[PDB]
Amino acid sequence: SGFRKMAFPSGKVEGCMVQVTCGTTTLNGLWLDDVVYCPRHVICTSEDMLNPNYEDLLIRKSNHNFLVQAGNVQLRVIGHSMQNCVLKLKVDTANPKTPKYKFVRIQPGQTFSVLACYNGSPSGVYQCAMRPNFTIKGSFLNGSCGSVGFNIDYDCVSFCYMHHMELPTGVHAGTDLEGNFYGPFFDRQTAQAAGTDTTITVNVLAWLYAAVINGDRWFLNRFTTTLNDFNLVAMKYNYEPLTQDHVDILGPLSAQTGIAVLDMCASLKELLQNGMNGRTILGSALLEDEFTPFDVVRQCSGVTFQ
Amino acid sequence: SGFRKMAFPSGKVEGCMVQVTCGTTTLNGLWLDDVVYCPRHVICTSEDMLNPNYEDLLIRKSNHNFLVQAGNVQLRVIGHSMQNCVLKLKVDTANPKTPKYKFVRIQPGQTFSVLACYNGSPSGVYQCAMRPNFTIKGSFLNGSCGSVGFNIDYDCVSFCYMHHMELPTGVHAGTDLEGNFYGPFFDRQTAQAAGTDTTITVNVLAWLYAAVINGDRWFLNRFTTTLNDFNLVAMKYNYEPLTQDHVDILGPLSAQTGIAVLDMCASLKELLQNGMNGRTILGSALLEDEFTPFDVVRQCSGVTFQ
Ligand SMILES: *[C@@](O)(c1nc2ccccc2s1)[C@H](C[C@@H]1CCCNC1=O)NC(=O)[C@@H]1Cc2ccc(F)cc2CN1C(=O)[C@@H](NC(=O)C(F)(F)F)C(C)(C)C
Numbered sequence: 269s270g271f272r273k274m275a276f277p278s279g280k281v282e283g284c285m286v287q288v289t290c291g292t293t294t295l296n297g298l299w300l301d302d303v304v305y306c307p308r309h310v311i312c313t314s315e316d317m318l319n320p321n322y323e324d325l326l327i328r329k330s331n332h333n334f335l336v337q338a339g340n341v342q343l344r345v346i347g348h349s350m351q352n353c354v355l356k357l358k359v360d361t362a363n364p365k366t367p368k369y370k371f372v373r374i375q376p377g378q379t380f381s382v383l384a385c386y387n388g389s390p391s392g393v394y395q396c397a398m399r400p401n402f403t404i405k406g407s408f409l410n411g412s413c414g415s416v417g418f419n420i421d422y423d424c425v426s427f428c429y430m431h432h433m434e435l436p437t438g439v440h441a442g443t444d445l446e447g448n449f450y451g452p453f454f455d456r457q458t459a460q461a462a463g464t465d466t467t468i469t470v471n472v473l474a475w476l477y478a479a480v481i482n483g484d485r486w487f488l489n490r491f492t493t494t495l496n497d498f499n500l501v502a503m504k505y506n507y508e509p510l511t512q513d514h515v516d517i518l519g520p521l522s523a524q525t526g527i528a529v530l531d532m533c534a535s536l537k538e539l540l541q542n543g544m545n546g547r548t549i550l551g552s553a554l555l556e557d558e559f560t561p562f563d564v565v566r567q568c569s570g571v572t573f574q
Numbered sequence: 575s576g577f578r579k580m581a582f583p584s585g586k587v588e589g590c591m592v593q594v595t596c597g598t599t600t601l602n603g604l605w606l607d608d609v610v611y612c613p614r615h616v617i618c619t620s621e622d623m624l625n626p627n628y629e630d631l632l633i634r635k636s637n638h639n640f641l642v643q644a645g646n647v648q649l650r651v652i653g654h655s656m657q658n659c660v661l662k663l664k665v666d667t668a669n670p671k672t673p674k675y676k677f678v679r680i681q682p683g684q685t686f687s688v689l690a691c692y693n694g695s696p697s698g699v700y701q702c703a704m705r706p707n708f709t710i711k712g713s714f715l716n717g718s719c720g721s722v723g724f725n726i727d728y729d730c731v732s733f734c735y736m737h738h739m740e741l742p743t744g745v746h747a748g749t750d751l752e753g754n755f756y757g758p759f760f761d762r763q764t765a766q767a768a769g770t771d772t773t774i775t776v777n778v779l780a781w782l783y784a785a786v787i788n789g790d791r792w793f794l795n796r797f798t799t800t801l802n803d804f805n806l807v808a809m810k811y812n813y814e815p816l817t818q819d820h821v822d823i824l825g826p827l828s829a830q831t832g833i834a835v836l837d838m839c840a841s842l843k844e845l846l847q848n849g850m851n852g853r854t855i856l857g858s859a860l861l862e863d864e865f866t867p868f869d870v871v872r873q874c875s876g877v878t879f880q
C-alpha cells in the first residue's frame with residue numbers, strides 16, 4: 269500500500285554525467301559511448317546570451333576549446349558537431365558505464381524522472397511530466413542545464429529530456445536528446461512564455477483508479493456519463509479532452525477495479541463540480557495529473573484492496 | 575525555480591542491493607563490504623508468520639541454508655548472526671561497489687529517500703519522512719522487505735531505514751540498520767497499529783519559507799505571535815509543539831527571507847484558522863510537512879526571489 273511520486277533509480281544515468289566547459293561557461297553533459305551531449309549554448313559568453321548565431325559562434329571554436337571532465341578525469345575532445353540545439357563532442361574515451369539506452373521524444377502528458385545535476389555531479393532525482401503546453405514544472409537552479417530526464421524499461425534507459433531554460437513563470441523548457449525543443453521555445457533570451465496549460469485528464473483518471481486500488485472509494489458515485497457530455501464538463505474546467513484512445517488505455521485499470529472508464533468519468537465530473545469537501549485522495553487535496561496509467565500500474569498492486 | 579519532492583540519487587545504494595533466500599522466503603538484502611544485512615524474518619516459513627521465536631528458528635539453520643544472489647552471481651554465506659531484528663550474513667566476497675557509508679538512527683520529523691526493491695532489483699525511488707508516530711507513509715508491496723532508506727552527504731551514504739512491515743492503516747514500520755524498530759512495533763503478526771500521528775510543525779514552516787524563496791508571499795500577514803500562543807493553536811490543530819531549538823534551526827531560512835520565525839508562525843496560525851481559500855502553495859492545497867529545513871536549503875536557491 270501507499271502511493272508516492274516515484275522516480276526511476278538513477279544509477280545508470282549518474283554514471284553518464286560529466287562537466288563541459290567552454291570559455292568561462294560550464295554546464296552538464298551526458299557521456300554515452302564516445303560522445304558527450306550538452307546544450308549548445310555552452311559556447312555562449314556573457315555577451316552572447318541574447319540572440320546568438322550559433323553557427324557563427326561554433327565555427328570560431330576548435331576541439332581544444334572544449335573541456336570535458338568526468339569525475340577527476342579530463343576527456344580529450346576529438347570532434348564536435350551541432351545537431352539542432354545540442355552539441356555533440358566526440359571524446360577519446362568510451363564511457364565504460366554506458367547503459368543500454370535509447371533517445372525518445374515524448375508526447376505531452378508523459379512522465380519522466382529528472383536527475384538534477386550541478387558541476388557534473390548529481391544532486392537529486394524527482395518525477396515530472398511534459399505539460400500540454402510543453403513546459404515542465406521542474407526544480408532547477410543556475411548550473412543545472414544539461415541535466416536530463418529519462419524513463420527506464422528492463423535496464424534500457426530512454427532519455428527524453430535535456431534541460432535548457434527557465435521561463436518567466438518559473439517553469440522549464442528543454443529539448444529531446446537530438447536537440448529539438450519541446451514546444452515553441454528557443455535557446456535565446458527573447459519574449460517567450462508558456463502558453464496556457466491544461467490538466468491532463470487521462471492522468472487524473474489513472475490516479476483515481478490508483479486510489480481505488482489502494483482501498484479508497486469515497487469519491488465514486490452511482491452515475492455514468494457519455495464521453496461527449498464528460499468532455500463538455502472537461503472543457504469548462506480547463507481539462508484536456510478525453511479520447512477513445514485514452515479510454516482504451518485505461519482499460520486495464522478499469523478491469524482491475526471493476527469500474528468502467530465512463531463511470532470513473534462521472535466521478536471525476538462530480539469532483540470537478542463539487543470539490544473535495546475538505547477530503548483528500550492519496551494524500552492530496554488537489555486532483556493529481558502527473559501519474560500516467562503506466563505509472564499507476566508500475567507502482568500499484570495488481571490486486572485491488574476490495 | 576520550482577520545488578519538488580526530491581530524493582537523493584540512488585546509484586550508490588543500487589549497487590548494494592541483493593536477494594536473500596531461506597527456504598521459500600526471498601527478500602532484499604544490503605551488501606556492504608563482506609556482510610549482507612536483511613530482515614531476520616527471512617527465516618520464517620508460512621507457519622512461522624505469527625509469533626516466531628527467532629532464536630529458536632535461527633539455531634536450526636546453517637550457513638548453507640541462506641542463499642545470497644547479487645545480480646546473477648551467488649555469494650556463499652560463511653557466517654551468520656542476528657542483531658535485534660536484522661540478520662547479518664557474512665559472505666565470501668566484499669562488495670566492490672561498497673560506498674562510503676554510515677548507519678544512523680534518525681529522529682522523528684527527519685526525511686530520507688527510499689529505494690524500493692523487488693527480488694534484489696531496484697524499482698523506484700521516493701522521499702518520505704519518519705512520522706512522529708514512527709511509521710512511514712511509504713509505497714511498498716509484497717516482496718519489498720529489506721528495501722532501505724538513506725540520506726547522502728558528500729558521497730557518504732547514511733542508511734537509516736530497513737523495511738519490515740505494513741500496518742493495518744497502510745503505513746509502514748521498520749528498523750534502523752542495527753535492527754531496532756522505530757516506534758513500538760515488532761516483527762510479528764499481532765495487534766499493532768500506528769499511534770495517533772501529528773503534523774511536523776517545523777517542517778511546515780520550512781516549506782512556507784521555501785514558498786517565499788521561490789517568490790510567493792500571498793499567505794503572509796502583518797501579525798506576530800509569541801511561541802506560547804502559537805503552540806496553543808498548534809495543539810488545537812494536531813501540530814507538534816514548536817520548540818526554541820526548532821526556531822533556532824529555522825534561523826538561516828528566516829535570515830535569507832527577512833521573515834522572523836514567529837512572524838512565519840503567525841502566518842501559519844492564520845492558514846490553520848482560515849484555510850487556503852482555494853489557493854495553493856508550491857502546488858499543494860495542503861500544508862506540506864515532509865520537507866525539513868535542510869531539505870529546503872538543499873533544493874532552493876540561496877537567493878530569494880524578492
Ligand atoms: C542553465 O544552467 C544554463 N546556464 C548557462 C549559462 C551560460 C551559458 C549557457 C547556459 S545554460 C540555465 C538554467 C536556468 C537558470 C536560471 C534558474 N533556473 C534554470 O533552469 N539556463 C539559462 O540560464 C538559459 C540559457 C540561455 C541560452 C541562450 C540564451 F540566449 C539565453 C539563455 C538564458 N537562459 C534562461 O533560461 C533565461 N530564460 C529565457 O531566456 C526565456 F526566454 F526562456 F525565459 C533566464 C532569464 C536567464 C532564466
Ligand SMILES: *[C@@](O)(c1nc2ccccc2s1)[C@H](C[C@@H]1CCCNC1=O)NC(=O)[C@@H]1Cc2ccc(F)cc2CN1C(=O)[C@@H](NC(=O)C(F)(F)F)C(C)(C)C
Binds near residue numbers: 269615624739
Ligand atoms: C515484506 O516484503 C516481507 N515479506 C515476507 C514474507 C515471508 C517472510 C518474511 C517477510 S518480510 C512484507 C512487506 C509488506 C507486505 C504487504 C504489503 N506491503 C508491505 O510493506 N512484510 C510482511 O509481510 C511482514 C513480515 C512479517 C514478519 C513476521 C511476522 F510474524 C509476520 C509478518 C507479516 N508482515 C506484515 O507486514 C503484516 N503486518 C503486521 O503483522 C502488522 F502487525 F505489522 F500489521 C501483514 C498483515 C502481512 C501486512
